[PDB]
């Protein structure tokens, strides 16, 4: 799985081991803790 899983910036700069990608932009806006995903933790 690639491409951002939120704003679909167009490509996945970081494909988490959970299949939840997140472009840098977004990754630079979210705190991100526990090397987890916001779509899962919630």
CB of 13 to Zn ion, least distance (A): 9
Q: Which of 15, 14, 23 is nearest to 1 (CA)?
A: 15
CB of 26 to Zn ion, least distance (A): 3
- Round to whole Å and give the CA distance between 20 and 35: 11
How many Å apart are CA 35 and CA 9, to the nearest integer? 21
Residues forming the site for Zn ion (CB under 5 A): 4, 6-7, 9, 18, 20, 23, 26, 37, 40
State in angstroms the smallest separation of the CB of 23 from Zn ion: 4
Residue with Cβ nearer Zn ion (14 or 40)? 40
């Amino acid at each position: 799985e690639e491409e951002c899983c939120i704003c679909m910036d167009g490509r996945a700069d970081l494909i988490l081991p959970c299949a939840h990608s997140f472009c840098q932009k977004c990754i630079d806006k979210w705190s991100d803790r526990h090397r987890n995903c916001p779509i899962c933790r919630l």
